[PDB]
Symmetry: D3
Subunit: 282 residues, 6 copies
């Protein structure tokens, strides 16, 4: 019944990408008003202070994610949190915070696996390491604060771009991965069912990266990758997860207004969030 929205205008890495503008764009797509139209009483908590830029910014990223984690950990139980963002790095904080010390399942819908470590990453970008850090792998400065899930409780969906070392780390941690190959073979409905089954009995945290959507349909993303999910597919996925009645938190990240076309990518993620929260055509 209660939903809290918080943004993390973060765009920290080797170079800027423009995703720090994601929260404003999402709010612009009327996420709050539509959540109210749905029947939820909503409160916008504002934004988490984030340093900007002119393993880069690890401490600044760590610092912002920490403020975020602490903020979400303090929300009363029964409050569904929605973290809006730019850099997927924020999920280190949202997942660790929204989990509130319990065992929770993570449904990571991304074109990327974000399972790199300082040793396997070709770019050194922390925003390509959040899920690995959440699983207990990576820089000591990050895992000491955000390690919150067991790789056995993580399901990746829509992945279509992986780094060599990433593949090794995912196989050895044994993370369940549904790449676009699996989507093209099984369809999103069966994959959604397998997701719920693989993580049965667990509260669910959904981390939705805008880039999972095909860039032809959703151009405004931090790192575009060709051939992703259609809008109806991402929708069906959210609907089925919603039906489980087990989703407890959500991240809407990587929106990049600079590359967007009339905020349509921000609008799609807002639409996806509504489905995850039970919005149906009828």
């Amino acid at each position: 019944e209660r939903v809290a929205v918080v943004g993390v205008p973060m765009d920290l890495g080797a170079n800027r990408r423009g995703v720090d503008m994601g929260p404003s764009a999402l709010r612009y797509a009327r996420l709050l008003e539509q959540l109210e139209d749905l029947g939820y009483t909503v409160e916008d908590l504002g934004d988490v202070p984030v340093s900007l830029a002119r393993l880069a910014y690890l401490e600044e990223i760590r610092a912002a994610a920490l403020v975020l984690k602490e903020r979400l950990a303090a929300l009363p139980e029964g409050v569904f949190p929605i973290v809006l963002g730019g850099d997927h790095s924020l999920s280190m904080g949202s997942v660790a915070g929204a989990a509130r010390g319990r065992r929770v399942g993570v449904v990571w819908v991304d074109a990327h696996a974000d399972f790199n470590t300082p040793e396997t990453s070709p770019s050194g970008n922390v925003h390509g390491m959040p899920l690995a850090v959440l699983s207990g792998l990576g820089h000591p400065r990050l895992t000491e604060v955000f390690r919150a899930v067991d790789p056995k409780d993580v399901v990746l969906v829509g992945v279509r771009s992986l780094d060599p070392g990433e593949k090794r780390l995912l196989k050895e941690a044994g993370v369940r991965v549904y790449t676009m190959h699996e989507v093209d073979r099984l369809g999103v409905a069966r994959i959604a069912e397998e997701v719920l089954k693989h993580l049965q009995g667990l509260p669910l945290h959904v981390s939705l990266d805008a880039d999972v959507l095909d860039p032809t349909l959703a151009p405004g993303v931090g790192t575009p990758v060709p051939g992703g999910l259609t809008y109806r597919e991402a929708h069906l996925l959210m609907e089925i997860l919603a039906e489980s009645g087990r989703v407890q938190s959500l991240d809407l990240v990587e929106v990049n207004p600079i590359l967007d076309e009339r905020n349509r990518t921000a609008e799609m993620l807002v639409g996806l969030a509504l489905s995850l929260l039970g919005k149906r055509i009828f």
Copy 2:
């Protein structure tokens, strides 16, 4: 063997949308020439006189739909009519006219249900009430002229946007509705089969609103709604209905050249019309 084309350059409502230019755009996409290439002897009857604008225009809309109804009712039996348009309001006249007093099935392919009444409509637009009026619900001034079908003989396909009161009216009239949720679950082939079965033994009138197509693919529509049918999907739907051999009339409405990209939306509807009339790749 014989086809008649008539346009209704109507754009009457709270504000203009530009759909009055739909008929010209459709004719521009060579609908007639291609119908001849298909083997049909075609005659363009021209356009129905329509008042323009500088419950708005109910009488003017009613007046144009009346001229249209009378015109189609007068066509010799055996003549397949194709009504080109702007406002979906025209279907009050096309369906009532092309039905010629018989019991006919209505396959309404639209992103909207157009099942509002003066009491449930948030905007007061008559172009959002045609199907309800055809079913016997709404303003006395409209139902007295256009009530032509029983809600049990109506099938809606592709709906993805509904008003609260609309939902009530559709449930209580018991109208069969296949929203995008059903399309994502069953596929258009099975839905097409269920359409034919639900309306078995009846002549079929297909009302195709351009907005049923995803606006990313078909931008030139009166009221765009994200996440609709792909072009191949709408095609398969038309092909299967064509196979029934029971389609007796067709509406091609809501084309909006102002928002279109090189008339591609008008071309898609023309293509859809050809499939409905039996055009196959081979």
Copy 3:
């Protein structure tokens, strides 16, 4: 004080171009409402019946232009007429009609000279012969109805595309021509002054073809030609002509919604019409 608007949805030639949708697009850009905001009492006379198509259509073009000429000739004196259109062929009727038998000056702002005859025209299109016909040159069937001006009272502005025979006809009729070369040399202000001087003491009829504007700025035109007037230039031209206090009628033709981008070309012509009618920033 009084203005009358009439449209001629004409697109008759070797092939369609889509300009028959020009009048609706122009009305869509709120020409009437803005003329009222300016202080004029306006009446929209509707559209002139025009045959459509599936020396082509000379008789049909002649027939529509005739209805138009008769219509404008009947307007009370003191009524300023604005003819909206598609094909520039309509000016045969607007100029001959709005002239009301008097001697009037014609300021033709077009990328083309429209001074071809059946003998010099490479395409045979009548919409490339209106100004020549108005000057008494061309097909007997057209000059017998529309010859209304002396070539000495004609000024062409912005021309950048001419056919070999056209050049001969213009030189021998001695028509004053300001091509883009002259605009690049003198500026539109001096050319505007020379226009008023060359036609001093005469009532002025302005025929504005949308294609005079650079197609990068105004893409929605019947026949686009690269490197035309900027929007500010066309504006200044209209302002200076307006200052003369001698403009008595206006044509706004060749708008092509199919190629337009959000009706911006139709909006520009509406804006140009307002300046011609005295609209100033202050």
Copy 4:
């Protein structure tokens, strides 16, 4: 030698426009790095806290502008401030703050005059009243904090859109105004000279609204208005003002990433800022 940059992510009015993302977009266009490349030692002061929205927000706008005014008033003399923004309302604070109690000239380059008051404004938007408030006209709650200039020391350039009451207020306050009509007549060089002369002997504060640029060239603005300055024109203007050696502060406002095309509008304003600060091709 010293420059300070501060952003005001403000988008407060009847409805959002998306200009709160202007500061990030501008920083994204590398304003700071390029100012350093120019030879300036730069410090980014960050952003002024601004309330967001879900005579609207007058107090919230007043509150943010107050924090801004106080911030700029505290900068050491010799520090050139550059206020980045969204809503032009911020200039109430930047001008009043950067003036530091002295008599300063205001060069307002905008498509609008922003000279409305609660009595003349058709929309009630405060972002359409900043210059009037700075001149001592408008709501007591605003003039009591931001009145900082005499209308005789204000020069408006590029205006092309005015409200009826605005015209009255500007005439009676006797504000010097160079609309696009004057730009089309005199050229920007002579207007720039007249600006410097009209405000001779005074320190100069330049308030640059992105919408002064033609929207065809710079689409990403809060309120687009057709037919504005070209990029070279705005440049020449900045160069000539730079040559005076009297410019002491600058506002870069109304950037709207949502409507922009690859941040090109933000890049143009950054380019304009460099010229104002002395950047030359050679």
Copy 5:
């Protein structure tokens, strides 16, 4: 292990289409580098000399295809050839050359069947006759050089546009054809399986025409045709064919940079080529 790349910058027909720029565009999409990243040792053989233009160019087309055929026939066995191109006419040479006199299966993925002869072709374009010529049908000057396959060993996939005579020729030669109708019914996976089965035990040559992809997704093609394969579909097709381990050669043709959007169509074909060569997400 070894791959050879050769381009055929050919754009010969009734009029130019711009496909001669296809090879450069494809090389631009880093086909070679990515093939190396995959583990292949690659050598770019450069381009086949092709006459340009200012049954047209039959001899010039024949001459270029001959040089190509001879070139590929000379490659050591074990070398996988990839012919980049413009005109699909080149396949007369690539198929005949890469076949090296053996019996090989041809998987032609095209929106067109390219099965016309001088007698059935409405345009006379040789680039619409390559597959027929390869099958032994057409001009003596072409079949005497390129006849290399039996129509029983040819499978067409994705066809959505056919000429009347083409249909006759395909039926009488008994060529297996999977049009978009079959793709909409069976899905690409089952069709891919049926392709492999229909051509079981044979080395496979894949001829991929860029136009098989939906033009909304891949605009840069010689002859665009609405409603084609999605990018994921074409991918799955390549993957399954790759799994057979029987693909021995590949054509990547009809890329048209002039109509492309940032070389995305060339990039898609490069991506498709990688899948055909075994590239997987994991």
Copy 6:
């Protein structure tokens, strides 16, 4: 009376830019046919063999420019050569070759000065050093082959982007430079006159880089630079130079189809070439 066209499909540098496709694009814009329509007897000499890429490629660039120089030096006197291209590096060969050992004036219309040397170049790209090499400055391997002009006989027009070392080299060689600042002050007509005067009595070689045009108008260029010449401006420049009757050769370089919009940039350069060769509206 005689014109020879030769292309140099060169795209050699730190990374590819796609300009090797410039010659085909230009030929695609019907340069030859239009030169004939103008009255010239034309012969297309084809393309100069150029190595492609997968101080980079100095020898390969040197080798191609050498073949080009030798080719043009061999043309009969009285033959006007037009070198089409990609990389501006080719001008080392075109200028040195078309000069035929005489003293000739060079009118370099570029957004860049191309006056870098191995010592001042931040990127090491040879395509940013051709004019300096032609003037006798730079790598011994290049000046020994292409030094053909005295810096006193060089005029640069439209420059808007310079490297620090470039500025030094231009000042010390005393090269006449008209940057966009001068164009904004004097206009292109006066600058054109000053060009002819500064190089009076000399045969003229015009080197036209597509990037001199504003990228908003002409996007398809190797290295786009904001705020350049309009199309009419570049035209007037060519017309005035044409009037001198002293132009003896021309380069049309840096066309980049990948970034172009429907080959409009290639069409503009073709149009510019016609004006340089005497094409007038009348």
